[PDB]
């Protein structure tokens, strides 16, 4: 593909050189073979030299076939035989892993490609074809680092380390083990609990889901050099892997038997460290079901400190073991792995760029990496700070890499042409029209080389992305889920949120700016990026700003939870009829609110109508706003850590639903507006407790329901129709003028504002179907619905 | 059959020729054998030529059978033996795939016919019967299609692709892989989301049920050829199939072990793409019973980026898996797979026309394909807008092919006759009565050839169908379920809705036009294709139009749901109507209302009396009308996308259930009318809350009992009686005159129009049984119930 070592590439060019030297017009394998032996003593080349082949001998044999004298060897490239040998070398390097493919693989691939002039060339020059593949194989690869250690020994390690299992310290003598960056400050906290054989167990608690495992490689490095105590000197850190135990087993009894064996071998006691990943599963205590009960052997082992071990558990798992104090709590003593510092994240990123240069686009951009964290940290916000991050890096680290190869410069037109040639050419010969295809044939390859030349002119579009992962790039990719087009979303938040909330600017700018402050630098995870009270009418403004955050602020597209406290309130029976679903906040804690935001930890959380809720509820919600967490639903922790909590209120709604009517004058209208954009900030005091509101930030203002507001409601309804018709592949847009015709059949005093949907149906739905059916307009072109004379007008556009 | 290759056909005609040339004016199999070898060196011919047989050698045996003479012909046709050889070859080519039968199959079919004139010719000319079938098998031709290959190799790739589960790439390197038509725009959305080595997992959400699976072959084609990232170059795409896992397994433990092996094999890591269809089952999280939990291994695989995979899930499935989090979140990232819409539908149909031209019906008719789509939307309705569609074409895509092979022109009478001949003949010789069978015998075969000649006139029904699925046919087939007699059902929807709601034209036209416009694929396919409110009293036209709507929009009246909203607030009944209602709005959303429409999306959903319902129910109905789907009730998504939502009212009822009186006018029924065609448009405002109701596509108007509707009620009830009697095979019709005699006992001023059923029983039911009992009328005689002298009158008709 593009990843190759020197020796390889060298064998390849020599084929072409010899192509012309023997007059082999297009070089199949015979020159590739020649290439191998003419590259002298590279692993392919060398191989051929072992069995007894000279550079000469091959070119002469090669020459005894295709031979003289197409010396020019017109547009000297390969033909399919040679191309097959090359495809094979790539795979013969996959074989090893061998990222940048070498010589050996090409001779190996040649044998593999055991026909053409090469294959027989080798079988003519006294070297059987498989004898050649042998020789390369037994000298395989080299493109990767060796071992920085050597020798073989054993001692106490014999009974134990055999079984089961991996020993991190060993692989780090060889220096094939990574730091890992972590969660660096996490690793230190282990050593109180681990150089201690009495709270013999360190116990890592955090998001799973953070790369806890980074800390484990930490230990490896540190037990070697050099802050190691005399305690952990004369110790080995051995990882007990779940995978070897399950392999070759499908019965519980066999698994337990193996665990019994681990305890026997644990005789290295007080000098052994055991690493137990997913520790909870083995104890199997608590819950409605277990998971296997190693606990019988394991508990006394922990108490004695013979099993001096390291436990990896998560946010929720721990409670049902400290409840079993003290035999799990006799060993445990805790450390925070929950959500790493912002900085720790960034460093992991930087480290894995080059392997997303094995997965291309990335290496770099540095700024894009930083962003990977930062943009993610608030913009999803569905994990811990590095998982999110890296996802951007490779996402963007491909999105644009996809744009890398998708055209020539604009010479995509070449390919279009090249197609048409083939056709003409072919079909003409299929009639034959021999020579009537001939010139068409000739036109094909003429075109072709020009095509291919400019398809690799979009190697310039490779040099653009293939070690960058851009700011904007990373950012767009975060938006794709939900620096540049997230920090432009963030910095320009006010501008973008204003374009999706029509009027009632008072609110928009208030949320915008508070969120934009937090969302730029670090408000720093825990607490939503904004707590807010959204005051206003029951109608307009509230939801729409919340929404607008979800689309831009949170990325591109969705991200908004929304619960009404008002919908249930009731419980208890003795003989009563009632058996309704839980009274609402009990439902929320016990399941609904906590689950939903746990599902997407980045959601604009809308806690509706808490005025019409008991003041006790507000305390619970207050924890969401403060902590950025709730712990409910069987001890699970729900990350509201960069959500936007929006607690709504519409207490007094009606006056903020004053329409633009003439009272005294037509200046009662502009005072049905003006009065209402004042009245809102008074619906705040009336809303909830001050204690609640004391954990709630800006005072978001929404107001009125002018006239003005009617034709603004029409513009929500017409868009709901037209979007479901976009689903059906019809592009419609209504100008204000067609929405005007809807208002024409949409005002009475007594009819409210019910006819507006129906009249949109009448003027849009009904009309578009009566305009498409005629053939005046068509689906998937742009169809503009207007009034342009006091009556409705249908326009067409592309 | 319909398709054969030359070599076959050539072998066949040569038999007949040689038959007579040797003195056999009946073509025995002895000549077919001769035929095979007389075609020289085709696979049949050649085969015989191997065994030591020439055409000459065959004809010699043949001449030693009948031999000279019999060159006077017999209008030489085959023997029953010879007809057997042909039937056999068909299967001898089927078994070798081929449905276009070639030479080999014909000798093979001869062998099959291992006793007979051939059989003995071949067994007489000293070659084994099986030696001959061997020879034909061991050379094929006319069974292939042309593909590519020239060698095969592998490397590390071996253990993985073996297992489990084949690669799309392989068959597409032979270039035999299909496009698929798709769902093309879906494939594109993947490449940011997948060419990551992080949250590299695309997850396809759509309807299943739309042809999601089309997208998967998409990847195959684009990852191979030819402009794609360097990321997605140096990759392999492997498809994982559930079927292989379950095979050789019958326990959960074994399944997990196999999955462990797969997980180990993901070692092609960071450059391997695994396709997992129905992804949800493996994660096993959520639900009331979950599924087998692969997640323990799979979750870190997704996080590591070793498992870069493609998830196929549906509308409903996803929620309880992103709920798991957060390496799930840093895995998945969503992309939109086709939500069913008419334009998309057509493109699939057309694509699979040629492939249902295996049915020699469809491919085409163009109008018929479009119709399939458009008609499907309105006439069942239950499935998805493109699945439905293709099914009608293929349905019909056999339907006319059935009408094909059951015709002589009208000469069906011939076959009937030809039978009778045999009888006479047979029975006469069984007495013998030799020549008393003879002339009957002779008469038989005269007939027979005439019969067969006119049965093969119905090659005209082939020339109809073998690329035309009939427009009318598609319609017929949709009518079979529930263009022409479904688009006439559509176009004439108004006419059809009018014929069962007598009076109340006001209502009929309002529903009619809105659906009839809409269902032509020109209205949103994700919202009820007509929303309506039906106002009136309790009954009288309302429901009846809903029924008539089912017929006209959907093709039969059996497309009608009907749910009462007053139960979704319940405060009337609890032990006399419905079991366990409490929770009530929760009962509707959470369960009942949604469950019912989830059973049939092929329904006029008539949600009665939302007026007299808890205000939450109106909000719920509002979601049905807006979204076209609701997701509730274990997170299942109910498609109201091809329902007709109809919300009923009856708060004006009294005038709208009023009856005519004189008072001062005999124009009092027609003054009961005039009041009611007003009374509905005032019952709307009085009934409902505005937020819900305005999404309705038309306000449907009904009437009362008057004088005048009463005598129309008698005609509804009498039709309910006579129809449940049709099941036994009583063919009944009432004229208006008999319904009149019945009316005589139920036009009470003070006992209502309820007595009419009872009086229908006395004058219709009771009367038919008392007319059957005396043998005046009969089953399968059409029985007319009349008055013709002011008293009841019994008539008979065919």
PDB file of C-alpha atoms in Angstrom, chain B residues 548-747:
ATOM      1  CA  UNK B 548     -65.268   2.957   4.899  1.00  0.00           C
ATOM      2  CA  UNK B 549     -61.826   4.632   5.158  1.00  0.00           C
ATOM      3  CA  UNK B 550     -60.190   1.329   5.952  1.00  0.00           C
ATOM      4  CA  UNK B 551     -61.812  -0.016   2.764  1.00  0.00           C
ATOM      5  CA  UNK B 552     -60.932   2.887   0.516  1.00  0.00           C
ATOM      6  CA  UNK B 553     -57.483   3.827   1.763  1.00  0.00           C
ATOM      7  CA  UNK B 554     -56.470   0.374   2.821  1.00  0.00           C
ATOM      8  CA  UNK B 555     -58.491  -2.059   0.748  1.00  0.00           C
ATOM      9  CA  UNK B 556     -60.767  -3.716   3.221  1.00  0.00           C
ATOM     10  CA  UNK B 557     -62.619  -2.624   6.321  1.00  0.00           C
ATOM     11  CA  UNK B 558     -60.267  -4.856   8.324  1.00  0.00           C
ATOM     12  CA  UNK B 559     -57.836  -1.960   8.559  1.00  0.00           C
ATOM     13  CA  UNK B 560     -59.418  -0.222  11.521  1.00  0.00           C
ATOM     14  CA  UNK B 561     -58.176   0.134  15.107  1.00  0.00           C
ATOM     15  CA  UNK B 562     -60.438   1.847  17.678  1.00  0.00           C
ATOM     16  CA  UNK B 563     -59.273   2.826  21.139  1.00  0.00           C
ATOM     17  CA  UNK B 564     -61.229   4.847  23.749  1.00  0.00           C
ATOM     18  CA  UNK B 565     -59.384   7.783  25.346  1.00  0.00           C
ATOM     19  CA  UNK B 566     -61.919   7.989  28.191  1.00  0.00           C
ATOM     20  CA  UNK B 567     -60.398   4.723  29.488  1.00  0.00           C
ATOM     21  CA  UNK B 568     -57.080   6.592  29.588  1.00  0.00           C
ATOM     22  CA  UNK B 569     -58.369   8.751  32.423  1.00  0.00           C
ATOM     23  CA  UNK B 570     -60.781   6.112  33.710  1.00  0.00           C
ATOM     24  CA  UNK B 571     -63.393   7.073  36.220  1.00  0.00           C
ATOM     25  CA  UNK B 572     -66.227   5.113  34.625  1.00  0.00           C
ATOM     26  CA  UNK B 573     -66.167   1.316  34.934  1.00  0.00           C
ATOM     27  CA  UNK B 574     -63.484  -0.795  36.547  1.00  0.00           C
ATOM     28  CA  UNK B 575     -65.310  -4.105  36.988  1.00  0.00           C
ATOM     29  CA  UNK B 576     -67.742  -3.930  34.091  1.00  0.00           C
ATOM     30  CA  UNK B 577     -65.429  -2.626  31.387  1.00  0.00           C
ATOM     31  CA  UNK B 578     -61.668  -3.239  31.034  1.00  0.00           C
ATOM     32  CA  UNK B 579     -59.382  -5.058  33.454  1.00  0.00           C
ATOM     33  CA  UNK B 580     -56.799  -3.062  35.432  1.00  0.00           C
ATOM     34  CA  UNK B 581     -56.923   0.514  34.082  1.00  0.00           C
ATOM     35  CA  UNK B 582     -55.143   2.680  36.888  1.00  0.00           C
ATOM     36  CA  UNK B 583     -52.154   4.826  35.902  1.00  0.00           C
ATOM     37  CA  UNK B 584     -54.262   5.886  33.091  1.00  0.00           C
ATOM     38  CA  UNK B 585     -52.226   8.154  30.758  1.00  0.00           C
ATOM     39  CA  UNK B 586     -49.277   5.863  31.514  1.00  0.00           C
ATOM     40  CA  UNK B 587     -51.490   2.940  30.552  1.00  0.00           C
ATOM     41  CA  UNK B 588     -52.002   4.454  27.084  1.00  0.00           C
ATOM     42  CA  UNK B 589     -48.451   5.636  26.403  1.00  0.00           C
ATOM     43  CA  UNK B 590     -46.641   2.935  28.352  1.00  0.00           C
ATOM     44  CA  UNK B 591     -48.760   0.134  26.991  1.00  0.00           C
ATOM     45  CA  UNK B 592     -52.134  -0.153  25.429  1.00  0.00           C
ATOM     46  CA  UNK B 593     -52.724   2.543  22.778  1.00  0.00           C
ATOM     47  CA  UNK B 594     -49.244   2.201  21.316  1.00  0.00           C
ATOM     48  CA  UNK B 595     -49.251  -1.640  21.517  1.00  0.00           C
ATOM     49  CA  UNK B 596     -52.449  -1.805  19.464  1.00  0.00           C
ATOM     50  CA  UNK B 597     -51.157   0.333  16.582  1.00  0.00           C
ATOM     51  CA  UNK B 598     -47.853  -1.563  16.847  1.00  0.00           C
ATOM     52  CA  UNK B 599     -49.865  -4.674  15.983  1.00  0.00           C
ATOM     53  CA  UNK B 600     -51.474  -2.955  12.992  1.00  0.00           C
ATOM     54  CA  UNK B 601     -49.855   0.081  11.373  1.00  0.00           C
ATOM     55  CA  UNK B 602     -52.341  -0.983   8.701  1.00  0.00           C
ATOM     56  CA  UNK B 603     -55.172   0.803  10.333  1.00  0.00           C
ATOM     57  CA  UNK B 604     -57.385   3.763  10.558  1.00  0.00           C
ATOM     58  CA  UNK B 605     -56.553   4.400  14.213  1.00  0.00           C
ATOM     59  CA  UNK B 606     -59.724   5.897  15.667  1.00  0.00           C
ATOM     60  CA  UNK B 607     -58.946   7.328  19.104  1.00  0.00           C
ATOM     61  CA  UNK B 608     -62.364   8.075  20.454  1.00  0.00           C
ATOM     62  CA  UNK B 609     -63.343  10.888  22.729  1.00  0.00           C
ATOM     63  CA  UNK B 610     -60.013  12.519  23.419  1.00  0.00           C
ATOM     64  CA  UNK B 611     -62.290  15.368  24.581  1.00  0.00           C
ATOM     65  CA  UNK B 612     -63.205  13.350  27.637  1.00  0.00           C
ATOM     66  CA  UNK B 613     -59.716  12.323  28.558  1.00  0.00           C
ATOM     67  CA  UNK B 614     -56.962  13.475  30.904  1.00  0.00           C
ATOM     68  CA  UNK B 615     -55.049  16.430  29.343  1.00  0.00           C
ATOM     69  CA  UNK B 616     -51.890  14.242  29.088  1.00  0.00           C
ATOM     70  CA  UNK B 617     -53.587  11.918  26.593  1.00  0.00           C
ATOM     71  CA  UNK B 618     -54.009  14.841  24.157  1.00  0.00           C
ATOM     72  CA  UNK B 619     -50.267  15.456  24.310  1.00  0.00           C
ATOM     73  CA  UNK B 620     -49.749  11.751  23.603  1.00  0.00           C
ATOM     74  CA  UNK B 621     -52.061  11.805  20.596  1.00  0.00           C
ATOM     75  CA  UNK B 622     -50.199  14.950  19.546  1.00  0.00           C
ATOM     76  CA  UNK B 623     -46.986  12.902  19.365  1.00  0.00           C
ATOM     77  CA  UNK B 624     -48.696  10.344  17.129  1.00  0.00           C
ATOM     78  CA  UNK B 625     -49.828  13.045  14.750  1.00  0.00           C
ATOM     79  CA  UNK B 626     -46.490  14.860  14.722  1.00  0.00           C
ATOM     80  CA  UNK B 627     -43.781  12.205  14.917  1.00  0.00           C
ATOM     81  CA  UNK B 628     -45.635   9.316  13.349  1.00  0.00           C
ATOM     82  CA  UNK B 629     -44.000   7.120  15.907  1.00  0.00           C
ATOM     83  CA  UNK B 630     -43.842   6.886  19.644  1.00  0.00           C
ATOM     84  CA  UNK B 631     -41.235   4.874  21.458  1.00  0.00           C
ATOM     85  CA  UNK B 632     -42.584   3.423  24.684  1.00  0.00           C
ATOM     86  CA  UNK B 633     -43.706   0.052  26.077  1.00  0.00           C
ATOM     87  CA  UNK B 634     -40.318  -1.642  26.574  1.00  0.00           C
ATOM     88  CA  UNK B 635     -38.720   0.882  24.211  1.00  0.00           C
ATOM     89  CA  UNK B 636     -40.570  -0.464  21.148  1.00  0.00           C
ATOM     90  CA  UNK B 637     -41.348   1.900  18.279  1.00  0.00           C
ATOM     91  CA  UNK B 638     -44.868   1.917  16.942  1.00  0.00           C
ATOM     92  CA  UNK B 639     -45.328   3.130  13.393  1.00  0.00           C
ATOM     93  CA  UNK B 640     -48.449   5.264  12.979  1.00  0.00           C
ATOM     94  CA  UNK B 641     -46.708   6.205   9.719  1.00  0.00           C
ATOM     95  CA  UNK B 642     -49.332   4.605   7.487  1.00  0.00           C
ATOM     96  CA  UNK B 643     -52.229   4.854   9.846  1.00  0.00           C
ATOM     97  CA  UNK B 644     -55.029   7.361   9.584  1.00  0.00           C
ATOM     98  CA  UNK B 645     -55.400   8.966  13.041  1.00  0.00           C
ATOM     99  CA  UNK B 646     -58.978   9.943  13.783  1.00  0.00           C
ATOM    100  CA  UNK B 647     -59.991  11.505  17.052  1.00  0.00           C
ATOM    101  CA  UNK B 648     -63.590  11.432  17.905  1.00  0.00           C
ATOM    102  CA  UNK B 649     -66.005  13.823  19.537  1.00  0.00           C
ATOM    103  CA  UNK B 650     -69.606  13.763  20.708  1.00  0.00           C
ATOM    104  CA  UNK B 651     -70.188  16.770  22.988  1.00  0.00           C
ATOM    105  CA  UNK B 652     -72.811  18.229  20.577  1.00  0.00           C
ATOM    106  CA  UNK B 653     -74.553  14.837  20.442  1.00  0.00           C
ATOM    107  CA  UNK B 654     -78.174  15.820  21.273  1.00  0.00           C
ATOM    108  CA  UNK B 655     -79.005  17.567  17.965  1.00  0.00           C
ATOM    109  CA  UNK B 656     -76.704  15.148  16.234  1.00  0.00           C
ATOM    110  CA  UNK B 657     -78.796  12.266  17.585  1.00  0.00           C
ATOM    111  CA  UNK B 658     -82.111  14.175  17.382  1.00  0.00           C
ATOM    112  CA  UNK B 659     -85.071  12.729  15.560  1.00  0.00           C
ATOM    113  CA  UNK B 660     -87.568  14.273  13.274  1.00  0.00           C
ATOM    114  CA  UNK B 661     -90.957  15.165  14.644  1.00  0.00           C
ATOM    115  CA  UNK B 662     -93.659  17.038  12.739  1.00  0.00           C
ATOM    116  CA  UNK B 663     -94.578  20.042  14.829  1.00  0.00           C
ATOM    117  CA  UNK B 664     -95.252  22.271  11.904  1.00  0.00           C
ATOM    118  CA  UNK B 665     -93.278  20.739   9.105  1.00  0.00           C
ATOM    119  CA  UNK B 666     -92.664  17.506   7.299  1.00  0.00           C
ATOM    120  CA  UNK B 667     -89.344  19.074   6.347  1.00  0.00           C
ATOM    121  CA  UNK B 668     -88.306  18.386   9.921  1.00  0.00           C
ATOM    122  CA  UNK B 669     -85.908  15.558   9.068  1.00  0.00           C
ATOM    123  CA  UNK B 670     -84.361  17.939   6.545  1.00  0.00           C
ATOM    124  CA  UNK B 671     -84.355  20.523   9.430  1.00  0.00           C
ATOM    125  CA  UNK B 672     -82.748  17.978  11.683  1.00  0.00           C
ATOM    126  CA  UNK B 673     -80.147  17.865   8.887  1.00  0.00           C
ATOM    127  CA  UNK B 674     -79.571  21.608   8.468  1.00  0.00           C
ATOM    128  CA  UNK B 675     -78.899  21.935  12.215  1.00  0.00           C
ATOM    129  CA  UNK B 676     -76.304  19.157  12.256  1.00  0.00           C
ATOM    130  CA  UNK B 677     -74.251  20.176   9.291  1.00  0.00           C
ATOM    131  CA  UNK B 678     -73.529  23.184  11.597  1.00  0.00           C
ATOM    132  CA  UNK B 679     -73.480  21.439  15.038  1.00  0.00           C
ATOM    133  CA  UNK B 680     -70.226  19.594  14.365  1.00  0.00           C
ATOM    134  CA  UNK B 681     -68.174  22.732  13.660  1.00  0.00           C
ATOM    135  CA  UNK B 682     -69.269  23.983  17.170  1.00  0.00           C
ATOM    136  CA  UNK B 683     -68.665  20.637  18.890  1.00  0.00           C
ATOM    137  CA  UNK B 684     -65.027  20.826  17.874  1.00  0.00           C
ATOM    138  CA  UNK B 685     -64.258  23.993  19.868  1.00  0.00           C
ATOM    139  CA  UNK B 686     -66.323  22.708  22.835  1.00  0.00           C
ATOM    140  CA  UNK B 687     -64.757  19.293  22.923  1.00  0.00           C
ATOM    141  CA  UNK B 688     -61.024  19.575  22.900  1.00  0.00           C
ATOM    142  CA  UNK B 689     -57.926  21.377  24.044  1.00  0.00           C
ATOM    143  CA  UNK B 690     -56.257  23.177  21.094  1.00  0.00           C
ATOM    144  CA  UNK B 691     -52.628  21.940  21.215  1.00  0.00           C
ATOM    145  CA  UNK B 692     -53.501  18.485  20.024  1.00  0.00           C
ATOM    146  CA  UNK B 693     -56.377  18.959  17.648  1.00  0.00           C
ATOM    147  CA  UNK B 694     -54.864  21.333  15.155  1.00  0.00           C
ATOM    148  CA  UNK B 695     -52.561  18.675  13.597  1.00  0.00           C
ATOM    149  CA  UNK B 696     -55.754  17.133  12.198  1.00  0.00           C
ATOM    150  CA  UNK B 697     -55.967  17.187   8.398  1.00  0.00           C
ATOM    151  CA  UNK B 698     -59.752  17.858   8.178  1.00  0.00           C
ATOM    152  CA  UNK B 699     -62.828  18.220  10.362  1.00  0.00           C
ATOM    153  CA  UNK B 700     -65.277  15.490   9.566  1.00  0.00           C
ATOM    154  CA  UNK B 701     -69.008  16.161   9.894  1.00  0.00           C
ATOM    155  CA  UNK B 702     -71.797  13.740  10.822  1.00  0.00           C
ATOM    156  CA  UNK B 703     -75.536  13.680  11.493  1.00  0.00           C
ATOM    157  CA  UNK B 704     -78.366  12.064  13.526  1.00  0.00           C
ATOM    158  CA  UNK B 705     -81.178   9.618  13.536  1.00  0.00           C
ATOM    159  CA  UNK B 706     -83.691  12.133  12.051  1.00  0.00           C
ATOM    160  CA  UNK B 707     -86.562  10.229  10.483  1.00  0.00           C
ATOM    161  CA  UNK B 708     -84.388   9.281   7.946  1.00  0.00           C
ATOM    162  CA  UNK B 709     -81.162   7.685   9.186  1.00  0.00           C
ATOM    163  CA  UNK B 710     -83.393   5.262  11.137  1.00  0.00           C
ATOM    164  CA  UNK B 711     -84.531   3.494   7.945  1.00  0.00           C
ATOM    165  CA  UNK B 712     -80.766   3.395   6.997  1.00  0.00           C
ATOM    166  CA  UNK B 713     -79.962   1.704  10.374  1.00  0.00           C
ATOM    167  CA  UNK B 714     -82.461  -1.095   9.519  1.00  0.00           C
ATOM    168  CA  UNK B 715     -80.358  -1.615   6.353  1.00  0.00           C
ATOM    169  CA  UNK B 716     -77.106  -1.866   8.344  1.00  0.00           C
ATOM    170  CA  UNK B 717     -78.489  -4.430  10.799  1.00  0.00           C
ATOM    171  CA  UNK B 718     -80.159  -6.658   8.129  1.00  0.00           C
ATOM    172  CA  UNK B 719     -76.776  -6.872   6.363  1.00  0.00           C
ATOM    173  CA  UNK B 720     -75.103  -8.030   9.612  1.00  0.00           C
ATOM    174  CA  UNK B 721     -77.602 -10.883   9.865  1.00  0.00           C
ATOM    175  CA  UNK B 722     -77.398 -12.167   6.282  1.00  0.00           C
ATOM    176  CA  UNK B 723     -73.548 -12.078   6.190  1.00  0.00           C
ATOM    177  CA  UNK B 724     -72.871 -14.383   9.152  1.00  0.00           C
ATOM    178  CA  UNK B 725     -75.182 -16.836   7.314  1.00  0.00           C
ATOM    179  CA  UNK B 726     -73.039 -16.635   4.117  1.00  0.00           C
ATOM    180  CA  UNK B 727     -70.400 -18.751   5.922  1.00  0.00           C
ATOM    181  CA  UNK B 728     -72.655 -21.854   5.694  1.00  0.00           C
ATOM    182  CA  UNK B 729     -73.192 -20.987   1.973  1.00  0.00           C
ATOM    183  CA  UNK B 730     -76.585 -19.238   2.129  1.00  0.00           C
ATOM    184  CA  UNK B 731     -76.680 -16.575  -0.607  1.00  0.00           C
ATOM    185  CA  UNK B 732     -79.060 -13.887   0.629  1.00  0.00           C
ATOM    186  CA  UNK B 733     -80.111 -10.401  -0.516  1.00  0.00           C
ATOM    187  CA  UNK B 734     -82.681  -8.045   0.983  1.00  0.00           C
ATOM    188  CA  UNK B 735     -84.535  -5.585  -1.144  1.00  0.00           C
ATOM    189  CA  UNK B 736     -85.628  -2.328   0.562  1.00  0.00           C
ATOM    190  CA  UNK B 737     -89.152  -3.754   0.649  1.00  0.00           C
ATOM    191  CA  UNK B 738     -88.272  -6.438   3.248  1.00  0.00           C
ATOM    192  CA  UNK B 739     -86.362  -3.982   5.412  1.00  0.00           C
ATOM    193  CA  UNK B 740     -89.679  -2.055   5.261  1.00  0.00           C
ATOM    194  CA  UNK B 741     -91.721  -4.915   6.806  1.00  0.00           C
ATOM    195  CA  UNK B 742     -89.133  -5.011   9.573  1.00  0.00           C
ATOM    196  CA  UNK B 743     -89.359  -1.245  10.192  1.00  0.00           C
ATOM    197  CA  UNK B 744     -93.075  -1.836  10.917  1.00  0.00           C
ATOM    198  CA  UNK B 745     -92.102  -3.195  14.379  1.00  0.00           C
ATOM    199  CA  UNK B 746     -89.586  -0.525  15.473  1.00  0.00           C
ATOM    200  CA  UNK B 747     -90.817   3.024  14.746  1.00  0.00           C
TER     201      UNK B 747
END
